[PDB]
């Protein structure tokens, strides 16, 4: 009945109006495209997110096991934020960051603000002070599990780390929306992530699928991300891409994947082709061709982005 379709639209609008856009969506809907987003380093993930990258002014959670690639994803977001003229901060309670690797994948490490805080509440308060400044495009918190309460650190009952996260996130969400700063919480499956799950606008589950071989020597991992929560665009999408040892997320490899997925790149044998021109025989050659030829990589990227959302 058309009388039903009127009441459904109405119901959706009341919901949308009462609790915000993205409060309900059809999974087949097209995404409303924001003015600016933070790209992820893989076009595949950017498409999975619907809006071409991470949202501004929101809480993001990126989680996965040890050696999943979750930190690499956050660092690519940092690099892109910086490359577009943004300021980045990294709140580090893990003490694991490798800046040489970060630099190689595109982070301006010299300009990166880093804090290594004494306690969980100090970490979040420093994040909060930085956010309220209005000067940051992105702040990354590594990691949730390491945000240990002052009382526990001073040797004084348990369950209060979750409460620490809840209160802080309540305060922080306001500051982020007002500032336009994106906050990424890295979380490791082994946490005060009960509250983060509801405050987050985007949640990404990151895993290693398989190791990429160079003859008999390892040169990276195929990486899978599922967007398990997404308030900006239909959730539950997933992407794969490559993380190459020493280099990070292969942008060019991902352009190829989505190129062929979208029919923009055709396949005649092991040869990948683009507009009757040949890219390479086998993935690595095609990948390599795109790094040597930045111009065709941008062209392919441009064409994937226009063919859908953005």
Binding residues among 88-107 for Na ion as defined by CB under 5 A:
98
List 38, 43, 47, 243, residue binding Na ion (CB under 5 A): 43
Closer to Na ion at the Cβ: 17 or 302? 302
Closer to Na ion at the Cβ: 43 or 144? 43
Site string for Na ion, 212-231 (x = CB under 5 A): --------------------
Closer to Na ion at the Cβ: 68 or 173? 68
Is 298 a binder of Na ion (CB under 5 A)?
no
Q: Shortest approach of Na ion to residue 79 CB, angstroms?
A: 12
Site string for Na ion, 62-81 (x = CB under 5 A): ---------x----------
Q: Is 70 annotated as a binding residue?
A: yes
Q: Is 22 annotated as a binding residue?
A: no
Q: Shortest approach of Na ion to residue 42 CB, angstroms?
A: 6
Is 38 a binder of Na ion (CB under 5 A)?
no
Is 138 a binder of Na ion (CB under 5 A)?
no
Q: Shortest approach of Na ion to residue 251 CB, angstroms?
A: 5
| Beta carbons of 243 and 69 less than 8 angstroms apart | yes
Site string for Na ion, 243-262 (x = CB under 5 A): --------x-----------
Tell me how far apart the alpha carbons of residues 169 and 299 are, in angstroms, rounded to a whole number.
Answer: 41
Closer to Na ion at the Cβ: 205 or 257? 257
**Among 20-28, 37-45, 173-181, 224-232, which window interacts with Na ion (CB under 5 A)?**
37-45
Q: Is 191 annotated as a binding residue?
A: no
Contacts of 96 (CB under 8 A, 6+ apart): 71, 142
Is 30 a binder of Na ion (CB under 5 A)?
no
Positions in the binding site for Na ion (CB under 5 A): 43, 71, 98, 251
- Residue ranges of the annotated binding site for ATP are 64-71
Residue ranges of the annotated binding site are 64-71
């Amino acid at each position: 009945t058309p009388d039903r379709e009127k009441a459904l639209e109405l119901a959706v609008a009341q919901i949308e109006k009462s609790y915000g856009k993205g409060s309900v969506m059809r999974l087949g809907d097209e995404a409303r495209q924001p003015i600016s987003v933070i790209p992820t380093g893989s076009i595949a993930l950017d498409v999975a997110l619907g809006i071409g990258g991470l949202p501004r002014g929101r809480v993001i959670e990126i989680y996965g096991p040890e050696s999943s690639g979750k930190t690499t994803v956050a660092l690519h977001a940092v690099a892109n934020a910086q490359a577009a003229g943004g300021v980045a901060a990294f709140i580090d309670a893990e003490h694991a960051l490798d800046p040489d690797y970060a630099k190689k994948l595109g982070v301006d490490t010299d300009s990166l603000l880093v804090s290594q805080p004494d306690t969980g509440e100090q970490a979040l308060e420093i994040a909060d002070m930085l956010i309220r400044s209005g000067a940051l495009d992105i702040v990354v918190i590594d990691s949730v599990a390491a945000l240990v309460p002052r009382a526990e650190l001073e040797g004084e009952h348990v369950g209060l780390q979750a409460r620490l996260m809840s209160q802080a996130l309540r305060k922080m969400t306001g500051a982020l929306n007002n500032s336009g700063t994106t906050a990424i919480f890295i979380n490791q499956l082994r946490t005060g992530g009960k509250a983060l799950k509801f405050y987050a606008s985007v949640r990404m589950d990151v895993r290693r699928v398989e190791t990429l071989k160079d003859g008999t020597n390892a040169v990276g991992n195929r990486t899978r991300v599922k967007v398990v929560k997404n308030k900006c665009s239909p959730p539950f999408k997933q992407a794969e891409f490559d993380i190459l040892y020493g280099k990070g997320i292969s942008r060019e490899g991902s352009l190829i994947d989505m190129g062929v997925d979208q029919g923009l790149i055709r396949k005649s044998g092991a040869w990948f082709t683009y507009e009757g021109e040949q890219l390479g025989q086998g993935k690595e050659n095609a990948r390599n061709f795109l790094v040597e030829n930045a111009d065709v990589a941008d062209e392919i990227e441009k064409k994937i982005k226009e063919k859908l959302g953005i």
